[model samples]
Target: TKLTIWCSEKQVDILQKLGEEFKAKYGIPVEVQYVDFGSIKSKFLTAAPQGQGADIIVGAHDWVGELAVNGLIEPIPNFSDLKNFYDTALKAFSYGGKLYGVPYAMEAVALIYNKDYVDSVPKTMDELIEKAKQIDEEYGGEVRGFIYDVANFYFSAPFILGYGGYVFKETPQGLDVTDIGLANEGAVKGAKLIKRMIDEGVLTPGDNYGTMDSMFKEGLAAMIINGLWAIKSYKDAGINYGVAPIPELEPGVPAKPFVGVQGFMINAKSPNKVIAMEFLTNFIARKETMYKIYLADPRLPARKDVLELVKDNPDVVAFTQSASMGTPMPNVPEMAPVWSAMGDALSIIINGQASVEDALKEAVEKIKAQIEK
Candidate 1:
């Protein structure tokens, strides 16, 4: 029988070529279709339960918990070679102690700096603020020293987590959703640090992803917190940039960003499950295929062997260091409310609308209420 797969546009050409090779070797035709990344999850949720979806899909690891709980994706069975991949990537794609996808790429935000403005990465948050002030004075406010999407929970998570805060307490039996630590003493300390940045004039109120991105690209900003997906734009803008892990929250306390993994998942209701599994394990999981995929879109490779192949790239090295310290973004369905709740808190806290303690306490309460409903 034939096998059908849905994937993002970035993988369409490479996967099509791979499909041809797979068909040539196995004598089973493979059809690859392109779907916009934003639409994949919603479309899959609608189609898969009706048994009309593609046999497999390429998606982020966060989708596993929701899809698996809904009985839409299959837990990979009899899959060995777990040691060849990064444990963090594997764990990101798993739910309820069962693997659901074959991870290929992982990404985490790091400190991206313009070489013209900053010579070295700062060692701690205090050092970073001091350096930022120096840069601002040097440029006479024509350029910003340090700026990022301050109101984004995704960008701020490193600080919160570095100071010993957690989104969900990860227990032995998966993530303990009921036990959120976002408003604990550590998180409040981290929030206070952010407020300090605002008070020190290092960070502006209302700065967001677009603002930070445009300013950095135009050489008006020195350093930003972003992931590999943004490197191409910086290159095209003729900006000589360097990647490094975010400065420590305190000495010996590293900023831990959220790690996001991209992988291939098989549909639970598909009749071609056997072939799909074969294609994933035998073809997509190979070192050569993984390397080619990395070349197509350069994120840090999930496979240990493939990572060794790309170690010469300094950006890859820096981001790998950052991802190593990151906590995997929890994949459980209960995590759905966290993004909005934490984002609202970050916005309020950064804008001086509420005290750090009050903002975070309210955000945690909102998260708990949503999870319970």
Candidate 2:
């Protein structure tokens, strides 16, 4: 029987092209089915157990834990060049040390600066702070050096992780859900760093997505921490900006951002298991195929060779570097609670209503209650 793949319409032509290639090479028909990206995961969960799902499914890495828990996907075996992909991206597709998917593209936030004003990207967070202070002093309310939505847990993660914080401990078994790290010592230390930045006017609490984008667009801010999504708007505004990995907390320590990887996985119950695996490992994994997909849509590809093809592209280089320095955003569903817990704590800290220690302590207690329930 012909094998089938479920992918979004945006990339369906790419897969269809590969399907035509598959036919000529192997004399086997391949069908590319269009599914709404938002609905694919939930639909796969419902359909796979009934033996009515596509042979291959493409989705975000976060589905690994939930899909594995439901026995909907299978471990990909011996794609030996697996390590060639970014370590963090590959890790995002693994749960309990068993690989579940092939990561294709990934995204994570980084420090983006107006190259017209800053001489160079700051080497350390303190250096960034000094630069911001100097810019604010020199411009006198006209152009601030640095600003981001500090109260947002996502934007705040580079600092939180830089100060040696983590969300959960990883072991060969899987993420230790019981060992929450949101309010640990390093996390508290990180929170104090935020407090200091706020007090010194190097950071602000209330600048959200809108304000941050507006300030940078208007040339009122020199630097912002954001992800790949904002690239077009900045270009349209005619701003000269440079993307860089988040500055280190200190000379040798990296500010770890959260990396999100998107990839494809095989259906555990697919009757054409061997064929599906062959298609992924031998055909879809081909450099030509990967590059074609990249050319069609232009997200960062996980293939090392394809990455080299974009070596001259600064934005891709910055994102790849940031992803390498970052941690996989936990693939487990339990991570849902950690976000709100951390967000609330950050809000409290920024509101000046509670000490960093007290706010983080409360956040952990809330998270603990959430997990237990």
Candidate 3:
């Protein structure tokens, strides 16, 4: 039987090449399927019934919740090579205290500003907002103080925490989305802060990742919140920029981000978990293969051994620092509902449909109901 593997387009090309190289060495037949990130989840629902999904699917660590619940994924055993991944990243792939996948890479959110426009970068969130306001007031034509994917949760999670909020509370039982830290002291400050920007019009183009990047590149915004993946594009656009950690709401405040890891997983029904493990543990864990992962994507290798290699490399240092203070995203089965409810709340608040407090409270209640069910 042939081993069927699935991944996104960008990942597919790389994996296809790797698969060819792998097959030549192992003498195993292989099939590679490529699907877009947006379509992968829905495709899984359709293909799962036919048992034609994939032996291995390249997906986010968060997918463990849905996949594990449906018995669509296999649990990854503790291996010596696992010692190579970052602790936070390892935790991302772990669910119900059991590891489910092999993290290929990790990432975090941070602030990136145009060095040419910004003379002094703020060390704190208040100062950053003030600077943004000043930039907007001083230059109104095409320059903005900040531009971000405000609607996209990836770019907003860190800032939300900077305001002193968390998505879930860990207890003796499980993740508690009901005890939302959003309306808490830190989160209130963050909500008001973001609202002030919108009210004052300091931040614009608050939709998708590309919109924010485009605004930043066109000089419509001096600062943009994003991940390391945009560094090359920023450079290519000839925008001189500097990367820094996301700011805390106050000078002494704390900020938490959703640290995510991209990992390789074995399907539970796979006829050969042993060979799959062998391929990953023995072949893919090497420095040579890991370096390629870093090269292909602006990701931090999850391997502890690879951190120094990544850290010493000038390109990934800022990202490493940005994630220095982050809470690994929940790996529990309940996270799917938690994220959906929270996103809905964010949308309502950002669009001026409701008060931040009420919206957040509604989110907390909705998710709690889901948990109770």
Overall lDDT per candidate, in order of appearance: 0.89, 0.86, 0.71
Clashes of each: 0, 0, 6
Pairs with backbone N, CA or C atoms under 3 Å apart (clashes), candidate 3: 84-303, 84-304, 85-302, 85-303, 86-302, 163-186
Once superposed on the true structure, which residue ranges of model 1 sit more than 4 Å away at CA? 16-27, 50-52, 77-80, 311-313
lDDT of 3 by residue, 194-285 (tens): 66767767654355677778878776768888888778788888887888777766777755677877777777766665676666666566
What is the RMSD, in Å, between candidate 2 and the native fold over all Cα? 1.4
Reference-based TM-score of each model: 0.88, 0.96, 0.75
Model 3 poorest ten-residue lDDT run: 170-179
Residues 1-373 of candidate 1 have per-residue lDDT tens digits of 8999898777878888888999999999889998876688888888898886889899999888888888899888755666788887888888878889988889999999998999888998899999999999999989999999998899999999889899888776667888999999999998899999999999988678998999999988998999988988999999999999999988889898999999999998888888998888888778888888888888898888888887569899788778878888999878889999999999899888999999999999999999989
TM-score (C-alpha, index-matched) for candidate 2: 0.96
Candidate 1: 10-residue stretch with minimal lDDT: 75-84
The reply for model 3, stretches above 4 Å from the true place, is 1-4, 7-54, 140-142, 151-153, 171-181, 196-214, 228-233, 251-254, 296-300, 304-316, 327-355, 366-373
- Sorted on lDDT, best first, the list reads 1, 2, 3
User: Which candidate gets the maximum TM-score versus the true structure?
Assistant: 2
**Between candidates 2 and 3, the TM-score winner:** 2
The candidate scoring highest on lDDT is 1
